């Protein structure tokens, strides 16, 4: 029945009210000092207990307790790494993350709860987890697949997830063959996230993966408009267009609530040009599971 890899997975395996607990490897800031805000990027150990797959969430309960003296809300993160892991043994499990800071109505200066104390571990610290979750975001079966994935910020998470599968890795069931094409939109050269990783996957497999970046403060179409992913995915409308068209092309869309809207606000327009209602175009999509999404 269905068209991803759905079959065996692990869900829930570790709950909230008896999460797994782990260990920091490592903890590295990969954005440059230029970047607005920091983004970090982290491994847990896990020893082959959280049996994950590619696309899937775990969460994380921070320390400390809430202002009712109880233990904070879980917060989801995607996974960064594929099943194998980083380190390729199935025994750890990598994130990506924003450290959350803000202003709150009095002019004061708030950090997210679990953003921080994510940002500020240690490697030999602990940390309580839970998961997996998520069927939403899994790949597809077909290894010949046409395979779109939109990112903002953090939202590289899962795709690099796909990506490490797909290029870095030998599998005895898995050959990728199709075309992967990945637009990342971020704010700076600065904060072009795993782009050396991708930039190798591109020189092995010239003919199979593409990349395209949308450096907003940077970076400025004809108009002069700012460079958000959407403005980048216009430049190859034509061409996204008529992938869409096609049975074995599946879209994954992860990372900041507001790409969405921009991204309708292409489409919209390219299909009514075609005499298609995008909407209902979408809605099909959805139902035939070729339009996959997860934003926050
Ligand atoms: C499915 C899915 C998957 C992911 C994520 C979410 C979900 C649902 N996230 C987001 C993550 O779960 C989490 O929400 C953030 O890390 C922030 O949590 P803290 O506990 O740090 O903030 P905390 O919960 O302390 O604060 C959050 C609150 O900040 C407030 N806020 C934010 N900006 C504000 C502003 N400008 N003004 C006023 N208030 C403001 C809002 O009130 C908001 O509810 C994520 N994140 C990530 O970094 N990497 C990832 O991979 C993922 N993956
Ligand atoms: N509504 C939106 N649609 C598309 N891209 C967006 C949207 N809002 C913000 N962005 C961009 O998503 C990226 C998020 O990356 P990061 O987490 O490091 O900030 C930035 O390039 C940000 O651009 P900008 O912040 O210049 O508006």
Same mark, same amino acid.
Request: with cysteine.
């Given at each position: ?8 997975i ?5 709950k ?6 782990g ?44 202002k009712?003296?109880?233990p904070? /809300?879980?917060?989801? *993160?995607?996974?960064?790494?594929? =099943?194998?892991?980083?380190? @390729?043994?199935?025994? &750890?499990? !990598? $994130?990506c ?20 104390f994510?940002?500020?571990?240690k ?46 890795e /030998?599998?005895?069931? *898995?050959?990728?063959?199709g075309? =992967?094409?990945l637009?990342? @939109?971020?704010?700076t &050269?600065? !904060? $072009? ?13 010239p ?37 869409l068209?096609?049975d ?8 900041l ?6 991204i309708?606000?292409i ?30």
């Open positions: 029945h269905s068209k991803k890899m759905e079959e065996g692990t869900v829930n395996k570790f909230p009210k008896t999460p797994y607990v260990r920091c490897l490592l903890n590295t800031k990969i954005t440059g000092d230029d970047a607005p805000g920091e983004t970090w990027h982290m491994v847990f150990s896990h020893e082959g207990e959280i049996p994950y797959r590619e696309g899937q969430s775990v969460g994380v309960i921070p320390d400390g307790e809430d009712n003296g109880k904070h /809300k879980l917060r989801l *993160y995607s996974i960064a790494s594929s =099943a194998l892991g980083d380190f @390729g043994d199935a025994k &750890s499990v !990598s $994130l993350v924003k450290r959350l800071i803000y202003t709150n109505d009095a002019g004061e200066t708030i950090k997210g709860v679990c953003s921080n994510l940002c500020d571990l490697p030999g610290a602990e940390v309580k987890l839970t998961g997996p979750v998520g069927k939403e975001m899994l790949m597809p079966k077909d290894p010949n697949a046409t395979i779109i994935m939109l990112g903002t910020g953090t939202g590289i998470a899962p795709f690099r997830s796909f990506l490490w599968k797909m290029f870095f /030998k599998h005895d069931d *898995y050959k990728f063959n075309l =992967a094409w637009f990342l @939109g971020v704010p &050269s600065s !904060s $072009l996230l795993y782009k050396e990783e991708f930039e190798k996957m591109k020189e092995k497999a003919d199979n993966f593409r990349l395209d970046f949308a450096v907003s403060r940077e970076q400025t179409n004809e108009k002069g408009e700012k460079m958000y992913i959407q403005t980048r995915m216009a430049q190859y409308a034509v061409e996204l267009w008529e992938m068209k096609k074995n092309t599946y879209v994954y869309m992860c990372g609530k507001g790409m969405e809207k921009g309708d606000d489409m919209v327009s390219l299909a009514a040009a075609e005499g298609i209602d995008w909407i209902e175009y979408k809605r099909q999509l959805k139902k035939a599971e070729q339009w996959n999404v997860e934003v926050y």
